[PDB]
Amino acid sequence: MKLAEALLRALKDRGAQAMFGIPGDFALPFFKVAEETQILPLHTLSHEPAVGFAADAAARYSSTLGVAAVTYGAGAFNMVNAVAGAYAEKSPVVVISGAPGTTEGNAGLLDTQFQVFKEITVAQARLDDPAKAPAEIARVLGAARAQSRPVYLEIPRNMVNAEVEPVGDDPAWPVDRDALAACADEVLAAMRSATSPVLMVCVEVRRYGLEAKVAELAQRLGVPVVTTFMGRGLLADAPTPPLGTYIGVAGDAEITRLVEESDGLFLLGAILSDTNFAVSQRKIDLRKTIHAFDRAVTLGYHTYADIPLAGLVDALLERLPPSDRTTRGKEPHAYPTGLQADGEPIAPMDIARAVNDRVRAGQEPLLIAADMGDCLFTAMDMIDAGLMAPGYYAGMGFGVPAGIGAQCVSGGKRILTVVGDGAFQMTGWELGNCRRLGIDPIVILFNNASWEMLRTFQPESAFNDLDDWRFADMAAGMGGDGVRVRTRAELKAALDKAFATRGRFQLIEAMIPRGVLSDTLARFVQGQKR
Amino acid sequence: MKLAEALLRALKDRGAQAMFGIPGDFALPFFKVAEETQILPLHTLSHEPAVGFAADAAARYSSTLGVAAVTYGAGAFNMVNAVAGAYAEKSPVVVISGAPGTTETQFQVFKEITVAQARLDDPAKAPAEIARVLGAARAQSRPVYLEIPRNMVNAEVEPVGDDPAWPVDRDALAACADEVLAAMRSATSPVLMVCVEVRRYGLEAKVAELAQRLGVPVVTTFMGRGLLADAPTPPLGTYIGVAGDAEITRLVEESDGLFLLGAILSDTNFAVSQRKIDLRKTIHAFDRAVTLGYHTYADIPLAGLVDALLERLPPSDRTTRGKEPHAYPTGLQADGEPIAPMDIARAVNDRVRAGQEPLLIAADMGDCLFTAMDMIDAGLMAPGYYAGMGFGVPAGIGAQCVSGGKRILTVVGDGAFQMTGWELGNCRRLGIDPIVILFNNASWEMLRTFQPESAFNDLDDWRFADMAAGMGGDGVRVRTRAELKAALDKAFATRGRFQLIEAMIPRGVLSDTLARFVQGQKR
Amino acid sequence: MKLAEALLRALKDRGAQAMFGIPGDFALPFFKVAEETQILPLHTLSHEPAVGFAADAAARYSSTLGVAAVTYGAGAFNMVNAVAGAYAEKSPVVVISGAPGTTEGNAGLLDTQFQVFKEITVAQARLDDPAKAPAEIARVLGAARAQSRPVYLEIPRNMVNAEVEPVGDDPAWPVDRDALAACADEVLAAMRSATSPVLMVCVEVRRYGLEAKVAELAQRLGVPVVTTFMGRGLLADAPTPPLGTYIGVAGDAEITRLVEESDGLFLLGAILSDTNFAVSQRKIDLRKTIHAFDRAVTLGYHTYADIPLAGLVDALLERLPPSDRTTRGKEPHAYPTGLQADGEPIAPMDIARAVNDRVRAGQEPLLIAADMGDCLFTAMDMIDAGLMAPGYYAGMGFGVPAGIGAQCVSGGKRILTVVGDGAFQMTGWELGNCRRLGIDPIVILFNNASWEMLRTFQPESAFNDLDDWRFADMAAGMGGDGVRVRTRAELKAALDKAFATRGRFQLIEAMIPRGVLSDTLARFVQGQKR
Amino acid sequence: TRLVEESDGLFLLGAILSDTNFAVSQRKIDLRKTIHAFDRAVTLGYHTYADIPLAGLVDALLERLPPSDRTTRGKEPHAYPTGLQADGEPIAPMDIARAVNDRVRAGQEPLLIAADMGDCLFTAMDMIDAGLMAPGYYAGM
Ligand SMILES: Cc1ncc(Cc2csc(CCOP(=O)(O)OP(=O)(O)O)c2C)c(N)n1
Ligand SMILES: Cc1ncc(Cc2csc(CCOP(=O)(O)OP(=O)(O)O)c2C)c(N)n1
Numbered sequence A, C: 001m002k003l004a005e006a007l008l009r010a011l012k013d014r015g016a017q018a019m020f021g022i023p024g025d026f027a028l029p030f031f032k033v034a035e036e037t038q039i040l041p042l043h044t045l046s047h048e049p050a051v052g053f054a055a056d057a058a059a060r061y062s063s064t065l066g067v068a069a070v071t072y073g074a075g076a077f078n079m080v081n082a083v084a085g086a087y088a089e090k091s092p093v094v095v096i097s098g099a100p101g102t103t104e105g106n107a108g109l110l111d112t113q114f115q116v117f118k119e120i121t122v123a124q125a126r127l128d129d130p131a132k133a134p135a136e137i138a139r140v141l142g143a144a145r146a147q148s149r150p151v152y153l154e155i156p157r158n159m160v161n162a163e164v165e166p167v168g169d170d171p172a173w174p175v176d177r178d179a180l181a182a183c184a185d186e187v188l189a190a191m192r193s194a195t196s197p198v199l200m201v202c203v204e205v206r207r208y209g210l211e212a213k214v215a216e217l218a219q220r221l222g223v224p225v226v227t228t229f230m231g232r233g234l235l236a237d238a239p240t241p242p243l244g245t246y247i248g249v250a251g252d253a254e255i256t257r258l259v260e261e262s263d264g265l266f267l268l269g270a271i272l273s274d275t276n277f278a279v280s281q282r283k284i285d286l287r288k289t290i291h292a293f294d295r296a297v298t299l300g301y302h303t304y305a306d307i308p309l310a311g312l313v314d315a316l317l318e319r320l321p322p323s324d325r326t327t328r329g330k331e332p333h334a335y336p337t338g339l340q341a342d343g344e345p346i347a348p349m350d351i352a353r354a355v356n357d358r359v360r361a362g363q364e365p366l367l368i369a370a371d372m373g374d375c376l377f378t379a380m381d382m383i384d385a386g387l388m389a390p391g392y393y394a395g396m397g398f399g400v401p402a403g404i405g406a407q408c409v410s411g412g413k414r415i416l417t418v419v420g421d422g423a424f425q426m427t428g429w430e431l432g433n434c435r436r437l438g439i440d441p442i443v444i445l446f447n448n449a450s451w452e453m454l455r456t457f458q459p460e461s462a463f464n465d466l467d468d469w470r471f472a473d474m475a476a477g478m479g480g481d482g483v484r485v486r487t488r489a490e491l492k493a494a495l496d497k498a499f500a501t502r503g504r505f506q507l508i509e510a511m512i513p514r515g516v517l518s519d520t521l522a523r524f525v526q527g528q529k530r
Numbered sequence B: 001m002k003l004a005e006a007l008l009r010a011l012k013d014r015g016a017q018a019m020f021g022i023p024g025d026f027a028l029p030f031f032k033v034a035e036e037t038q039i040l041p042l043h044t045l046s047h048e049p050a051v052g053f054a055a056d057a058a059a060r061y062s063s064t065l066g067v068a069a070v071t072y073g074a075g076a077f078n079m080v081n082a083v084a085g086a087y088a089e090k091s092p093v094v095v096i097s098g099a100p101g102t103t104e105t106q107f108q109v110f111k112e113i114t115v116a117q118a119r120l121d122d123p124a125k126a127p128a129e130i131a132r133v134l135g136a137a138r139a140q141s142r143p144v145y146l147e148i149p150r151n152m153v154n155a156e157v158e159p160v161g162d163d164p165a166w167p168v169d170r171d172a173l174a175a176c177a178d179e180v181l182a183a184m185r186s187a188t189s190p191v192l193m194v195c196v197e198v199r200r201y202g203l204e205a206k207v208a209e210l211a212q213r214l215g216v217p218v219v220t221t222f223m224g225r226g227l228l229a230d231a232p233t234p235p236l237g238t239y240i241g242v243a244g245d246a247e248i249t250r251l252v253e254e255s256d257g258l259f260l261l262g263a264i265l266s267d268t269n270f271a272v273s274q275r276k277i278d279l280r281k282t283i284h285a286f287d288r289a290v291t292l293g294y295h296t297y298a299d300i301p302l303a304g305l306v307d308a309l310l311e312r313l314p315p316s317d318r319t320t321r322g323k324e325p326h327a328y329p330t331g332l333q334a335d336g337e338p339i340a341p342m343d344i345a346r347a348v349n350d351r352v353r354a355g356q357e358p359l360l361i362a363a364d365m366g367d368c369l370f371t372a373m374d375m376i377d378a379g380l381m382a383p384g385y386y387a388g389m390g391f392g393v394p395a396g397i398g399a400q401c402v403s404g405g406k407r408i409l410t411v412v413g414d415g416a417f418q419m420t421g422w423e424l425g426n427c428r429r430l431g432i433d434p435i436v437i438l439f440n441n442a443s444w445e446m447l448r449t450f451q452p453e454s455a456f457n458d459l460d461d462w463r464f465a466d467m468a469a470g471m472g473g474d475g476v477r478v479r480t481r482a483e484l485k486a487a488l489d490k491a492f493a494t495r496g497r498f499q500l501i502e503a504m505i506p507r508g509v510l511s512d513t514l515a516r517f518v519q520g521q522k523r
Numbered sequence D: 001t002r003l004v005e006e007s008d009g010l011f012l013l014g015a016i017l018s019d020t021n022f023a024v025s026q027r028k029i030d031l032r033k034t035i036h037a038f039d040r041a042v043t044l045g046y047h048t049y050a051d052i053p054l055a056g057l058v059d060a061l062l063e064r065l066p067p068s069d070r071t072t073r074g075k076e077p078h079a080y081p082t083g084l085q086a087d088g089e090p091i092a093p094m095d096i097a098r099a100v101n102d103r104v105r106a107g108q109e110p111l112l113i114a115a116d117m118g119d120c121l122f123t124a125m126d127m128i129d130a131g132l133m134a135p136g137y138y139a140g141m
């Protein structure tokens, strides 16, 4: 078996679904075996940033390994940022970068590309030894899985075709029987002894597909359940569904206190930081806080190493007597609906109504891909079937690329994208690849003519005023159907159309005025004053 | 006086002509000063890469300092690429990243693509640090990194000093010069190659004087292209390896006393490769050093080395200007035939011969660059070594900003334009009207010429011309050579809006230069 | 200030006392600045192994940084083993290896030397940037101190003289106020709740010179105190002196049980392994065991990170009410004495008697340097003033070299060395450097004509039979006074002489017969049968 | 040394490249015109054939070259120092070489020589031997 093949098969053997990428000198031989073998569908994008962003999503979507293939040099570096956000958000993107042969020895910078990716991945390896390649691949791949984060793989070209033995399974990671038990023991003990124990569900839960067993726990535990942002959605159809989502300040002040004022706050697979919605360590009692994350548990200031979340859970159940309990009790949830189909100018919230109404009228929910900006804060109030945005990273550019990658693996489902003018100027052009990719995602451009999120924080500043890019009129070039709307009528009307029109990506240019924000973005700002 | 203010001033004194950037939370406080103090012009773009390329171009244009202002995280990262290629081609792009408050890793990455960094978290030190970093950027001509905590943009600081002098081993300088000169005189067929550093440190005059006194054959590199063309001893052409003229390539590579003055060594297409020359008999002066076979003199800035040699060579009136080191393709037959690269070159060269003034040209990667190589220009900016796409458009933009009125020409392939091409939407607010000739062959042709069998090099039809409108510019698509000639003419007559010329080119049609390149890889 | 100088001064500023080493092509320029500056005394040895072994001891002796200077290539690699044992035993040896200039670019193996030392040190760095050198040095040096283990420093020759700014202080390491407190709390709580809490004193205690405060703790704690091997000696003149030393099986079965059967076994700065005397994790209740080591505390299966032993102690006192208590109570200790000055053949134990008697007669105790083999197990029963041997490492070769390095910094004191024939054949020749070094250590060769320690475990094997190297007769060549003894008379007599004769190293070749072992080595073997 | 280094078609058959004293340095030759066959490979200017064990390469070339009787044995590629003047002068390396070489010339059979690092090696180089083992590249004592 050829080396490059042995790899792709491996990726496949692990639930891979595609391989996004852009070729270059050194990467052609590998794209060749990628194409000729036909192992993994080869989708190619216009700019490397979208390459990584799509891989990110194709990974988050199916909760499996994403695949970003780039060429040596500018190709890799031009994608660094996409991998960073993927890393930042436990999105296991397997990066592959063709490198010079092992007999061409000289670089161009005073390795380097390696040290940069060494910086944003969990494991890396230069496949320069056909003998060691197999296990090495198994290792690194085994890492992105164990840790759910990006990995780096360099393949010198004169090695893309070296015969190698097939790639086996992931190397078995460390797990101590006793250690674990002791951990659960202390964890459960800590919970039982708490006043207001609050169990939070986050990202690691959706990555290791553990929702299945955590629902069986949320029940046998008996404590209140809340989700973080990355956790939003989880346990929706579970016996003891979350009582809401935590996004901090801009959120339901009711949920807030419950979390920030607990003494049994069990952060399951949760992320920790001061990234907007993330659970800031500054806003909680570090004393009584069990923090399960990255195969480790830390509460009481001490830590339990090599403790896979799966195991922690599995052993927590072994100590919790089964329960037939259930806290559902009617009441769904109230989203902003009712659009004034009049000719009054659009506002972020109006759009929400727009989509929501369509849905309540009977429309199946489309998963949403949102870029960073006022489009994100507006997407929170929309009924979905999975949301997908850079909340804990704020990496503009995501939006469109992400939605694309999504619909590329959706196996039919359609993807909805929301993005502002400022971000569309960055990656909104990746739609030109929608024809070749055979997908028709619906996009809602939030053209407010400025970097509005930045203006709210420094309105005296002019530089945040942008030009009026006639996007709707540009959608024809990339082969789509564009439509700029000024009023709520042209808005509701256009959307309906979009769902009817398939085969071509639908781009609805929403004309919004500066100042006009979203309810959720409103609350967020008001909350930074006091 | 604020800190930001002090940096901006410190920046302007060293040549700064503008500031390209894109804000974010941490950047905001910094940008407020920027915008207000108006020390430097604050030009915003759309995507970080552009900002990086633009800033890079700006610097090169005025052989001065460039300035890219980003925000912490996604912002800074999404711009690493431009800074790298900058580092590669010795362009001092001063990177300014806003960052977290000091009371409230990117740093570890940048250290890998800048010859100097610093985090100004102490106002008492800020003044000197700024003066140290920029210093290097100037001394080594490479990108530097400055990371500012938003809670220090206003902190008062002693004015920024002057650059801190660098080690100049006066004795080695004199000893090298002797070895160097002797090494030359004593060689069968010695040759002088003028490269990148000669431009960056504005040493054209000197090297022009030396070129004559040293009395040896002259040649430029790819980045050395266009230097000493008005000197008594002009280059015999430009060496770019197998690609170009085989008489110059043979001379360069066969020399037994090669003097790479401020050049770059690298197996990287046009860069003077170590596998092509006889390094044993090479005198490579670079990064303030000089090598030559089991010997490297350190601390010898190029500039002083010239002076050294000049002090060791008697004056001369030896002038040897002949005819055309390189025949520029002309005579565009405006018939109905489809279009081809070399035709674009003629179309372009003819206007010039017709009397038009040669513009400076900015090129992205792809055949557009090889094509630009057969065009008459007044400067040529392109990633000839780094070879990274995207540079084209934003670089032409960036150039024209500080080109005080002069118009810039930009050649970009379809593949590349899809990455940065849209930055043209800023032309309007930016007060620019650059001309763009987009090579739409509907494919990543440069690669197809390496794997014509693969089908992924097949791109769809992007009606770029139809999109020019939406960016406040005029964009026309042409298929024949007749249409090509007419449209190019209109562009030049139309100023006020950027002009986009989407020239449709068949897959398989390559520039002459590129043709030669591929054929040389078959051998 | 020159780079190489800036460094040596740094070492000095940190308590350095010398710089052992062997030069080579690439290392000459650095030895030149080492010599010319005269900052640190430059002692040179015959073979690299002794270079590292002496540095090891010069470090352990004064409990400070040792200094091993070698040349690139064979020089470094030929010393790898010495550094390993130093690392293995928390001996902060600062290794310095001159490297090719930054403009000579090509190696000879398919970096490498760097990766090998990366493997046996705690921090490393290639000083190739005069600007960054200072802080870098401070860093690495700061590491060997914080972690008390070997560090690697590579100095390209064209950099030995680059002007640099002086080297500042060590970079401040992480320390969490809360975390710490929480740790002590749980630690003390764990202790108080124990039945037979046993506090052990080990290596880290002597390295960070903490004995001063630990004695103040051993008192305020109130629990039994025992020392490990590396810990042997500590708290001797303390209010609550150790009740004995723990060396496992071969030790006082009385001490053994107390340790292996505790539920409050506080291993202070202790090492953990199955290395002869070390506290094997296989022989203790991991459940109730506080393990303070490498700036971390682990008990109850969880761990407290970035917890410097100093701090742990300092905060433990803050929670223990001062005490005037004391458990001294006469009884010193009984060592094997009384030598039968008859003409009966020598046995390991006889020699012990020999030295001991001399001491009780009034001789000040000499610190001892013992190699691995039956000489070590015999040295345990000798009255000393500090013992120094590879107990937790078993790296033969140590002996002599070590003793030499010692007396090189002893500031006058004399050093005693014990070593078997088999090890003397490895490094016993380093005595030839005793004249130039101006020291006269007394050495006791245990020539049993074989690798006796190995023979006891496989007596049916012949290969353990060695030849009769006439060492005593070889001592003249290296410029010493050699004397082979066959009987206990020639033994007692020779020793007395040796203490009288100064200026020349004294080598007493003790003729012992195969089979004849040491009491302590006896007990050890008998203990491997059952 | 001049011939080797000036060659415009150098064929290092199973050699080692390295700037390491006696090892054939890359800075001394014209690598562009070098054919270095090593570690089961063959290089030559922007080209490296992999998987070509030396042995087979020879055979290859032999299959491409007609037989020959071209013999060119001359005299002493290297004059071995002899004639040890056994006077009372102190001793010197080259003398040891003569002492050694003379016994051989006197008829004694050349032995194989093993040398450590130091001048002893350079000295062994002027001695008549039946094999010479020494660390000429690694240079470790
Ligand atoms: C890669 C990168 N570069 C810059 C920034 C900085 C930023 C954070 S928010 C924002 C404004 C976004 O404008 P948009 O039209 O998309 O939506 P809206 O604000 O409602 O007008 C910027 C520029 C980030 N986060 N990432
Ligand atoms: C950031 C980056 N990613 C990939 C590549 C690799 C590449 C080198 S050449 C080429 C094809 C360019 O197509 P284009 O339309 O621009 O011009 P042409 O080939 O003549 O049709 C690619 C993808 C580079 N150099 N930089």
Ligand SMILES: Cc1ncc(Cc2csc(CCOP(=O)(O)OP(=O)(O)O)c2C)c(N)n1
Binding pocket: C372, C373, C374, C375, C394, C395, C396, C397, C419, C420, C421, C422, C423, C424, C446, C448, C450, C451, C452, C453, C454
């Ligand atoms: C560097 C190294 N190489 C080999 C060995 C293996 C060994 C462990 S014990 C022993 C015998 C030592 O004989 P010695 O004369 O010194 O004393 P004695 O046993 O009483 O006769 C050997 C060879 C070790 N530990 N280290």
Ligand SMILES: [Mg+2]
Binding pocket: A373, A420, A421, A422, A446, A447, A448, A449, A450, A451, A452
């Ligand atoms: Mg907007």
Ligand SMILES: [Mg+2]
Binding pocket: B366, B413, B414, B415, B416, B439, B440, B441, B442, B443, B444, B445
């Ligand atoms: Mg193209």
Ligand SMILES: [Mg+2]
Binding pocket: C373, C420, C421, C422, C446, C447, C448, C449, C450, C451, C452
């Ligand atoms: Mg022995």
